[PDB]
Design a protein around this ligand. Structure first.
Ligand SMILES: [Fe+3]
Ligand SMILES: [Fe+3]
Ligand SMILES: [Fe+3]
Ligand SMILES: [Fe+3]
Lengths: 201, 201, 201, 201
């Protein structure tokens, strides 16, 4: 209804051998699709709650909305944050490259901090590079599940799915290798565009 | 310092009798100030980590940042969302008023849903009215603590602090009385401004 | 129905001036009573769900049960963990005293660790001294809200309510003073009995 | 070391075809071992803190302990709760069987409620059947991660790991098929033993 499932800007197997087509197909067709259906159903439920003036399940509906909508947002950004190797620059440049050096010291320091945040998660979660509109800087955050451990108003620039379904079929328990191979398919041109729009408040 | 304590646009007792000046002074001078110092320290510690190449406490630092920065963000909007009785419109009008009718059916439905979300929180949290950039709609979210149960990219329009320190000294355990009194001091002018700036007309 | 509200083993004002009778009366009559009613209602809801074979709200009911039942358990232990000054020994002795020296080094070290855990909570929570039946030792835990951040099978020995409603009317934002005064009314004889029953697996 | 990795009461492929031996080996040798090392380190760090009188990282250490110790506890029960098909009763009997009928109406109702709690988890977690010492009854709880959404004093009787690593390699995203297969390998003899020891006859 309100939300729709976006299609991939590339073929399921375009990111191989870094991320297999098997994961991509299940991740998109099964997982992401579930969040879209869940977010719409949450809205229908909230609408029905208003019509009958019965808000007894408000706590459930607010979590259903937050969980599924955050899942939809996180994955929509995730797909575009990636592109076949060689399709995008190896490292950030111009506006983004300068900003990263300012807030992290160097590209490698930002990479090290992002990596540490990605692998240290106790449970499901995400590693994220966001624009802080209040402090007007780029920070790294560690999301719990899809909707926890983040300030309101945070604009996602670059995100990495650290839920097990994103790497288990390929890397098993070795998260370190998954994050290692992911750096090869990061679409820095997409992050650059997000950084530009985020900068206008 | 990257973050600083904003000054109140009114005196501590300007919201009486709806909200005690005793609560306002402690809430701003003590509580809000703490989030600013915490958020600044979190960034300093992270800079320390990168310099030493030691990210052992990454999980702690990332939570310290999200919790404190979110507290800073939540209270900053909270102060401006309020104004003395009779100094602002008693009802949303124009663009904001039309949007609320479109996404909630009416102003009464919006209030009912917002109130239900406020009083039903199991633990500390917030009742929020945010702009959803993906679905291009206004939704109500129920924050847990300061940084939980919310999608990234959510832009706060109207917020209500449901932590016990925000009402205990005056209303005790009666959460219902607190929320009912709070509706009288809502500055709809500020909300309308945030609504327009959330998407630039 | 299943759960009932236990009465205080002393008068509301018996713990003064460390904890006022005003807090005790509201905490018991209003707060604890709410958890008992909530826990029973959660069971009725789960029973009704089984009768009609409709488990659509299972996520809500499981959290309602866990939140309210944990609240009931935590406060039931909290009341007995306290007694008027002079009614119980100032420090633990015999079995308990020996165990504390073994797992913490000294009584003061356990006090310091417990205090640090109590005051550092980011949001609502509890500081707790529990018996770990797997490791067969006494550990300190920091509960989030009432039902988070604890292993299953943990047996509560000594607990301190760190929710704002437990100290705000008296100590305001100064948590440090609340914890400081609480040590004066700890009923070590009650903790000793809990330690004995916990030890038998 | 305070904690140690328990050995499996059967071979890795003993539960096939219901649960793959590939999953069993990684789950025990890699995953469970990690919680043991983490729990031990958490205690060593806490001892370090007391010695230095520096509890600055108390919030991190307390979460590290709860998360890892809970993982250790949850998996220890999980292994024993299972046995090869045909090596244990296919249905609860005697004392345990009568108790389930008393608290759930029937075995089918218990299974339905347990299944609903298992498949509906939003994120990582567990479906648990515990003994409630306060209410003197058997309840179903839905754990988040390893250490969330549960009352203190809860004694685990039967547990099901709903984290993605527990079923992804064999069942993919179909959680329903995993839970349906798992019922075939439940060792009701072990559950009955834990039920009796939870309250000593
Ligand atoms: Fe994912
Ligand atoms: Fe506040
Ligand atoms: Fe309390
Ligand atoms: Fe597991």
């Amino acid at each position: 209804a309100v939300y729709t499932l976006p299609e991939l800007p590339y073929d399921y197997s375009a990111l191989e051998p870094y991320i297999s087509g098997e994961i991509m197909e299940l991740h998109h067709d099964k997982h992401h699709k579930a969040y879209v259906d869940g977010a719409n159903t949450a809205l229908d439920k909230l609408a029905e709650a208003r019509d009958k003036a019965d808000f007894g399940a408000i706590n459930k509906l607010e979590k259903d909305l937050a969980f599924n909508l955050a899942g939809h947002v996180n994955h929509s950004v995730f797909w575009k944050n990636m592109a076949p190797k060689g399709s995008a620059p190896e490292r950030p440049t111009d506006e983004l490259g300068a900003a990263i050096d300012e807030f992290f010291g160097s590209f490698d320091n930002m990479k090290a901090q992002f990596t540490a945040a990605a692998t240290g998660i106790q449970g499901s979660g995400w590693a994220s590079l966001v624009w802080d509109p209040l402090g007007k800087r780029i920070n790294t955050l560690q999301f719990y599940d899809h909707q926890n451990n983040l300030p309101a108003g945070s604009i996602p620039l670059l995100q990495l799915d650290m839920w097990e379904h994103a790497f288990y079929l390929q890397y098993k328990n070795v998260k370190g290798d998954y994050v290692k191979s992911w750096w090869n398919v990061v679409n820095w041109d997409d992050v650059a565009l997000r950084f530009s729009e985020a900068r206008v408040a």
